[PDB]
């Protein structure tokens, strides 16, 4: 079948470019009814703390990228790395060497001076049955002496690299742990990986890994190497530079799919199409078709597509995510409007769900403060009269609703031979305390029957004083 993986080197969280890598590995698998696995490099026993790897698991969780297998931990496979090196040894396809760090520097110094790229000359390739003390003990892989290794990278095409300028790499360390390159091969092979989608730093490594597959007698995966993402200014985006954490987009209150749409479009396209559903991406995405030049961030673009989905999605889909942003502010939700009803009111006025909750709190708690400017729209007494009328009729039929309040409010503005301009203006100050809110029916409605009536009286008893 198709087997992809996402194997991140645990930092504090899931970096946005990791998210994209994971997205593509996830689509490639799902698309063909394949399996998508997740590995975790927890060999440091620091860095990878449970909070650090939960920040990854929860990041993937929120985005919707689920894995058929794992998370499968590098610590669980220490002795598996150990045994495959020993197998490689017994088969004469890897050797030990014992050069000191001082000795190795001498070779980097002797190599760079000739204008040749530093290698480890095969000084121990045919000999010692070493072992023991000498903490410089390293197991090195016998990389083929001559020729080339070549692979059809699905993105970058034919890459051919010569076996000269690929040295006999260390594959197993003195601390009982594999070198990076060996492990990814041991991992990919043991996990049946068929398509290895990764950033283009590792393109130089691929040939080494290929030669290790070959010695192992293992199927070589297809490789897909992509230009990693650029900073909004232009710098390359990375963990050392102050990178965008994906979870900061949950808290900023962008919709999850809005982001995977946003991500997908960095470095991939389908002619003129900018908005894909979860299906449109399964059906149309190909990892072949990712653009050979690096895509750049555009938080402006993100803002738009987030609004499109705010506007266009089912408000019930958005309801629980608003309840995330609302709950953050200390709100007792059970005593307020439905989140979905708020969505409908605010979705065309706000760019993020955090903007929305900030603007919706007025509905969800009492009306403690009034903007002084806006109360000088009670100024007249003749504010008492429209509010009193609003109040009378806002005792509307047991169907309390946007529509139900509109008619009531339409019927109050007439009883006074006034524009709805005049009934609504102070009524906005009564239930909001400010001159700004959605259309009055929406806002009168979001307070609830009880809440409006309380709020109106509260304004009325203030005006009578």
Curated annotation (Swiss-Prot):
InterPro entries: aa-tRNA-synth_I_cd-bd, aa-tRNA-synth_I_codon-bd_sub2, aa-tRNA-synth_I_CS, aa_tRNA-synth_I_cd-bd_sf, Glu-tRNA-ligase_bac/mito, Glu/Gln-tRNA-synth, Glu/Gln-tRNA-synth_Ib_cat-dom, GluQ/Sye. GO terms for molecular function: ATP binding; glutamate-tRNA ligase activity; tRNA binding; zinc ion binding. One of its GO terms (biological process) is glutamyl-tRNA aminoacylation. It is found in: Cytoplasm. It holds the Pfam family tRNA-synt_1c. GO terms for cellular component: cytosol. Signal peptide: none annotated. A motif ('HIGH' region) lies at residues 8-18. It catalyses: tRNA(Glu) + L-glutamate + ATP = L-glutamyl-tRNA(Glu) + AMP + diphosphate. A motif ('KMSKS' region) lies at residues 236-240. Its main location: cytoplasm. Disulfide bonds: none annotated. Keywords: Aminoacyl-tRNA synthetase, ATP-binding, Cytoplasm, Ligase, Nucleotide-binding, Protein biosynthesis. It comes from the Bacteria. ATP binds at residue 239. Its EC number is 6.1.1.17. Monomer. PANTHER family: GLUTAMATE--TRNA LIGASE, GLUTAMATE--TRNA LIGASE, MITOCHONDRIAL-RELATED. Catalyzes the attachment of glutamate to tRNA(Glu) in a two-step reaction: glutamate is first activated by ATP to form Glu-AMP and then transferred to the acceptor end of tRNA(Glu). NCBIfam families: gltX_bact. Belongs to the class-I aminoacyl-tRNA synthetase family. Glutamate--tRNA ligase type 1 subfamily. This is Glutamate--tRNA ligase. It comes from Xanthomonas oryzae pv. oryzae (strain KACC10331 / KXO85).
């Amino acid at each position: 079948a198709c087997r992809t993986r996402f194997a991140p080197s645990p930092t504090g969280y899931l970096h946005i470019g990791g998210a994209r890598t994971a997205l593509y590995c996830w689509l490639e698998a799902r698309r063909r009814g394949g399996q998508f696995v997740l590995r975790i490099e927890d060999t440091d026993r620091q860095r990878s703390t449970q909070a650090a790897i939960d920040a990854i698991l929860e990041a993937m969780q929120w985005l919707g990228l689920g894995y058929d297998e794992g998370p499968i931990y590098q610590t669980q496979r220490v002795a598996r790395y150990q045994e495959v090196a020993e197998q490689l040894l017994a088969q004469g396809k890897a050797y030990y060497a014992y050069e000191t760090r001082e000795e190795l520097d001498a070779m980097r110094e002797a190599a760079m001076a000739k204008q040749e790229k530093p290698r480890y000359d095969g000084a121990a390739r045919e000999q010692n049955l070493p072992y023991r003390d000498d903490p410089n003990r390293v197991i090195r892989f016998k990389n083929p002496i001559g020729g080339t290794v070549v692979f059809d990278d699905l993105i970058k095409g034919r890459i051919e690299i010569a076996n000269s300028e690929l040295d006999d790499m260390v594959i197993f360390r003195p601390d009982g742990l594999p070198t990076y390159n060996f492990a990814v091969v041991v991992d990919d092979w043991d996990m049946g990986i068929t398509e290895v989608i990764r950033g283009d730093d590792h393109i130089n490594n691929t040939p080494r890994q290929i030669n290790i597959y070959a010695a192992l007698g293992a199927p070589v995966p297809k490789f897909a190497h992509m230009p990693m993402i650029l900073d909004e200014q232009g710098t390359k985006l990375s963990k050392r530079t102050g990178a965008a954490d994906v979870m900061q987009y949950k808290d900023a209150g962008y919709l999850p799919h809005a982001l995977i749409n946003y991500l997908a479009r960095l470095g991939w396209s389908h002619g003129d199409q900018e908005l894909f559903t979860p299906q449109e991406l399964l059906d149309l995405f190909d990892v072949k078709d990712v653009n050979s030049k690096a895509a750049r961030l555009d938080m402006a673009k993100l803002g738009w597509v987030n609004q499109h989905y705010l506007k266009t999605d089912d408000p019930a889909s958005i309801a629980p995510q608003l309840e995330y942003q609302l709950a953050k502010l200390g709100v007792d939700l059970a005593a307020g409007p439905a989140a979905a009803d708020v969505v409908v009111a605010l979705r065309e006025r706000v760019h993020t769900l955090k903007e929305m909750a900030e603007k919706a709190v007025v509905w969800y708690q009492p009306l403690e403060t009034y903007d002084a400017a806006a109360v000088m729209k009670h100024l007249k007494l003749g504010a008492e009269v429209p509010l009193g009328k609003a109040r009378e009729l806002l005792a509307a039929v047991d169907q309390w609703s946007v529509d139900s309040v509109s008619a009531a409010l339409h019927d109050a503005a007439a009883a006074l031979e006034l524009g709805m301009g005049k009934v609504a203006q102070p009524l906005r100050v009564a239930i909001t305390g400010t001159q700004v809110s959605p259309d009055i029916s929406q806002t009168v409605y979001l307070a609830g029957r009880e809440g409006a009536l309380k709020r109106i009286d509260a304004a009325l008893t203030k005006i009578g004083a």
